[PDB]
Amino acid sequence: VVHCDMEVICPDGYTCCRLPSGAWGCCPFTQ
C-alpha cells in the first residue's frame, strides 16, 4: 500500500488527493 500519510492509505492502483479543507481522498484510475 502507498501510505500517502498517517491519515489515509491508497494502493498503487489508486491516486491520493487532498480536499479543499486539508482532508484526503482516494480515487482509482480505471476508466
Curated annotation (Swiss-Prot):
<comment type="function">
    <text>Promotes proliferation of the epithelial cell line A431 in culture.</text>
</comment>
<feature type="disulfide bond">
    <location>
        <begin position="10"/>
        <end position="26"/>
    </location>
</feature>
<feature type="disulfide bond">
    <location>
        <begin position="4"/>
        <end position="16"/>
    </location>
</feature>
<protein>
    <recommendedName>
        <fullName>Granulin-4</fullName>
    </recommendedName>
</protein>
